Amino acid sequence: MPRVDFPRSRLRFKEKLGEGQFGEVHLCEVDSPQDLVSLDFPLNVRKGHPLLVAVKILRPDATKNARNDFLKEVKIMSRLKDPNIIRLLGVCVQDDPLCMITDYMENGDLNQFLSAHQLEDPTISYPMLLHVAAQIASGMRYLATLNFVHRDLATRNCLVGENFTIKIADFGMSRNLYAGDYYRVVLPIRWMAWECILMGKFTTASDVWAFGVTLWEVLMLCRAQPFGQLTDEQVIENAGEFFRDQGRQVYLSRPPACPQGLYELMLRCWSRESEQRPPFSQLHRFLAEDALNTV
Ligand SMILES: CCN1CCN(Cc2ccc(C(=O)Nc3ccc(C)c(Oc4ccc5c(c4)CC(=O)N5)c3)cc2C(F)(F)F)CC1
Numbered sequence: 001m002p003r004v005d006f007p008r009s010r011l012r013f014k015e016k017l018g019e020g021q022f023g024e025v026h027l028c029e030v031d032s033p034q035d036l037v038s039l040d041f042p043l044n045v046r047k048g049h050p051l052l053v054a055v056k057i058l059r060p061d062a063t064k065n066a067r068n069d070f071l072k073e074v075k076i077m078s079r080l081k082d083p084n085i086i087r088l089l090g091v092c093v094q095d096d097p098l099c100m101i102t103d104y105m106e107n108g109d110l111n112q113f114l115s116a117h118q119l120e121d122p123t124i125s126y127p128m129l130l131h132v133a134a135q136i137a138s139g140m141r142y143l144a145t146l147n148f149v150h151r152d153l154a155t156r157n158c159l160v161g162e163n164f165t166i167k168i169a170d171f172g173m174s175r176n177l178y179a180g181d182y183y184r185v186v187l188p189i190r191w192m193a194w195e196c197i198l199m200g201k202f203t204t205a206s207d208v209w210a211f212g213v214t215l216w217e218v219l220m221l222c223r224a225q226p227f228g229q230l231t232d233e234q235v236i237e238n239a240g241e242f243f244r245d246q247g248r249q250v251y252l253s254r255p256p257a258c259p260q261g262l263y264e265l266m267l268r269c270w271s272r273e274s275e276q277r278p279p280f281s282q283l284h285r286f287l288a289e290d291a292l293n294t295v
Helices: 064-079 110-115 126-145 176-181 194-199 204-219 232-244 260-269 280-293
Strands: 011-020 023-030 052-058 088-092 099-103 158-160 166-168
Touching (some): 011 052, 052 064, 064 088, 064 099, 110 158, 110 204, 126 204, 126 280, 194 204, 194 232, 204 260, 204 280, 260 280
Antiparallel strands (some): 011 023, 023 052, 158 166
């Protein structure tokens, strides 16, 4: 927990960004940010331009548990300091409503971003795609080594900042745009490891499985839903065939842009045994070095 609250009096309401069970997210502008610039709130001020922030707000009528989940997320957010994780700029916890304030990424989520691009045969290059994926891996390595499990890694939960900087995020909002990505059994089954689906065992190993699917989205430039050839029920049945491991299961196909070695890395992310899936340190090293060095 930060010593001091960010001052609510400085948040100028622009727009409601969304909503979930917890409450809501607003886009705010920081009023006269140059006066707030300190060691405790190091803000990137640009004279003549609004400093925009996202603010996640706990509903006033929230339950004891919801309030506790929210404060747990505050404590977690306060720790995460890494170039590829969304950054906590401040909090408002003295009074209700409880708030978390983050940087605002104007390029939106990675899925929106890549969906608007096409591959360099607005364009994006294969090296840049590897750089995107390397940043996600690096963010996930940081998370894993702080003993955190994400549980919902996907391009929809990555944000694009400036100069192709990617930040892993976790919104907790219900966004109609991605409703088809979740299945009520409410779970992101197409990104989930077989053991998650069949048992509910969530681990860094299942985050690696999700990273694999996320790597596939990126290399597909987010043009198809993973396993779009399978209905939701059939995705569940497919998990059963991974457990079966008699080779009957459906694997995501090699994207056109993906060379064989990168595809086989993805395949290892989908190894039936968790311990054979590569750690994020290895995934990052392979994307930042081996894959980049063999363009
Ligand atoms: C087992 C469950 N895991 C535990 C570890 N958690 C880590 C975590 C938690 C919260 C967020 C998180 O992200 N929280 C958050 C905080 C504040 C706000 C305002 C918020 O959401 C925003 C909504 C819209 C926009 C932004 C933030 C920035 C923007 O440009 N738009 C989310 C991000 C992570 C991450 F990245 F490490 F994985 C993930 C769940």
